[model samples]
Target: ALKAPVVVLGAGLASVSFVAELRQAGYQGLITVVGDEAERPYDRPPLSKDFMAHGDAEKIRLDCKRAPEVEWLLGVTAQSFDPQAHTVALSDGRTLPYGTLVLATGAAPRALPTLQGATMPVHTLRTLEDARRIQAGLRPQSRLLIVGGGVIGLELAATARTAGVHVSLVARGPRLMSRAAPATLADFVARYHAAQGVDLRFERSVTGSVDGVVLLDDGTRIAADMVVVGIGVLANDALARAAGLACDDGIFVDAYGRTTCPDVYALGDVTRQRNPLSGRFERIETWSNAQNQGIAVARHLVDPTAPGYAELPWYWSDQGALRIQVAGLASGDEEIVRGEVSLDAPKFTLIELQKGRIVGATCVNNARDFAPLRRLLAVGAKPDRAALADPATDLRKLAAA
Candidate 1:
């Protein structure tokens, strides 16, 4: 017998998908979704790329389609939770009783700690309002200074450049997307942005900034009209931690998406779970993880023993004309390259091999290689080095063999 009322906290993709999956799974219960945002559920990826360009918040908006009748309470934050009483206290003066609780509050953008009381109009794209503010300043001949060389920073840089804005990207890392991609792919992206007229300063950091002038670590100064920070994100796991959940940087959840407390589950960027391939607990911040994990959590609630939630986490990033995709962790003992991995290659596939099996892969504008590569990686396909490095070889055949 399932519980009566299933209340989902934080109405993001994971929350919406969980509620939807319950309905599809023939669970009849009172489902309530509580969100602090006044707006309906929406996707966050476009906040950096598309929505910034077109400002069509409605286009990238998540379509939940249909689910069981849900009590949709928007613009109300969850003030506290009582696990013992199965109660959630809301900012709007309501204590919700629930048979089950889900924490999908997701993550928040990591702000530049140094700019606590700065007077400059600094920006970071996390919500619609952040994107709107950044987009407003993206104009022809406008000097844009961006800190961090991760996905959001690079994507926004590309968008700003497309609008004819002069962009300077500063990164403390030696290469772009260092944490996300291998050096081969990182170098390629670095060259891509440089070719596109983005003043990319790798191995650099900001010393200080006042007004619109930014001082780099090497004493380089740039007069910027606007500054955008895209360093990274911090999981919104403080709520779960305060509620006595095991947390370190993120809320630790089992493969079943359950926290330390029974009947209390978690999903989305807020959850730190086992990485299927790496056997380590990490926060999979991709859009796919949020969507798929929610559905898996729903299925797990129905049948606890129906296999484990061990899906390989993968994601794609659209930066201007280049479409980049990655799967598995980004390291290995051996690196195999198919096609030119250098700056000028039209398309490329870089696979990381541990021992002889494919452990991870990165594809740049090469869907042909990416699809087969992912399939091969899933099945623990061993490499025939000659076959592995051949662009013309049928990767599907290699995967099967």
Candidate 2:
């Protein structure tokens, strides 16, 4: 028996995709999407890129009108949840019951405690309003100081540079994107940004700020007209935790997005699913994970006996003029280092091997090589490391062989 009044606890990509997928799968149920943001469900990946470049609220909205129709309760948040009662308390002082529940509350950006009380405006990009405020504040020659070198910070730095803003990136770590990429690419990223005239402050972080100047932990001062913090985010797993569900930094969900609680599921940045390569619960926050995993879970809901959700996670980023894309995982049992990285329209690909099978790949400005490399990893095809490294070696022949 299918449930009724399917209540989705978010308005982001995952929630919308679930509703859309369920309806497409011929499920007949009342769907209500509860979003804390009043703005229509919009694309978030561009919040730090295209939207920052050109403020267009209408350009990125997800089409959710009619069919497997959704009743949107925007700007209202889930205040509490009672699993046994199958009810959620809204911030608006209303209690809503659900036959089935989907938790896609997503994540909230982490803020520096020292900058929290600063008189100068401190911004973090996660919502449409965040981007709007950041974009509106930018002017040519304006000084923008960024804290952290993660994806959001890097993307915004590039966007600010494109908009003619003088950018300075302050990262607490020694390398840029340390967790995502190998040192080979991380070094080049720092170099790439520095070459563009963006001040790269590696192994440094702001301890405090006064007026428009940030005081680093090392007693160095940096000036900026505006500050954007991109130190990463915390999963919004409070609701799940409060409801007695298993929570570990993020809510734990199976391949089918099923939580420990019955008829209650979670997806996207809020749920930690199994990483096939890492053998640990990892929260894949990329846009592709949200959309595809949402649809994947919905398919399983419509047919429980179908194949379990096991998608090889993939993501891409746009940094200034450079395009970077990665598939599978970064680290493995062993790594096969490939061609050199050339700064003048550079291209390089690295393959990660685990127990003699292709496990992951990282490519910069090399989609042709990356495409086959990524596909090879997806199907567990172990291509010769020498062939993978050689520029002239065809990936097709290596994989087929």
Candidate 3:
């Protein structure tokens, strides 16, 4: 009998990338992809940035033309999975048996306990539909209350402010992007947003929401027509858990994307693989990781001799005119400012060094330096501190040196 087809759950970027790579790698086997969302595969980064501003779905739609001869099971989820039987039961009452299974279910946005079951329109954006609802709900003078000072919240605030909507953001920490950015970069962004007329409330959290107003932990009340929570996301690993796979918040997978279960793999935002730099399992949730890791996994599957995925973790955000790009871990022993850091004319790179080697780098509206800095971070390059701090010193030369 011919071998059963490869069945992949959750048809996001990871699934699409995997199948496309598999075909390019010359695996002429049957393949099937399942997605809970009814729409075809699409890019996610724009959902909070460009989509919020322009409401254009066509630009963000991912074309699957490269993945030929693949069966797509859309608008249904995996109700249950059986590792032993190599079978998955779909929510639409269908069973699929596979030779290999993949979990790329990604994650869901976390909702606040205070706003749960609230009569007011509270939103947590993780999908195109969520973005649409928030966009539709906004009026010319709508007061939008955004919770969390992370990337999503900040981007939405920028988008809302440009549209003349009153925006107020509440964060539990003393500074913005504390988890994702360093103090230097975070402070620059905070100053820029404050100048943009966003009412940023730091060291505060949402305690309650009532009568079109959001109550804060500091006994401060914010009046708003709509509320959006951007307090991060939780991994969608229920299917893997049901099948007895090893998982904490995210499914534990090896560098080659193999889960504890034989012939079953997980990748993208759903898998917690060891970070090359940190040496601890973490979910690299950027779009770069999703596509690159999926391609890497496909290459390894097509040929076991292929190298495993070990790409450096990185992400970028565009808020108003300020663009921020960070690579590698934010933690390091020392910091170096490459260029002038100013709110009026921001163009700088914050280089993080550990033990005299580049550990991380944050570029603000300076894309020219980001490429070389990221390469230095990848290669663990130790450039001269004075050279790194000097804007006249070409990073390309330092990275080469």
- Go through the candidates in order and give each one's C-alpha lDDT: 0.85, 0.85, 0.89
Tens-digit lDDT track for model 2 on 84-142?
Answer: 88899999998889988999999999889989779887999999988988898999999
Provide C-alpha RMSD values for all models, in order. 1.6, 1.8, 1.6
Q: Which residues of candidate 3, in runs, are more than 4 Å off?
A: 1-4
Highest TM-score against the true fold, candidate: 3
| Whole-structure CA lDDT of model 2 | 0.85
TM accuracy, model 1: 0.96
Error of 3 at 142 (Å): 1.0
Give every collision pair in model 3: none
Estimate candidate 3's alpha-carbon lDDT, on a 0 to 1 scale.
0.89
Please tell me which model should have the higher TM-score, number 2 or number 3: 3
How many backbone clashes are present in model 1? 0
RMSD of 2: 1.8
TM-score of 2: 0.95
Model 3, residue 307: distance off in Å is 1.4
Worst 10 residues of 3 by lDDT: 1-10
lDDT of 1 at 99: 89
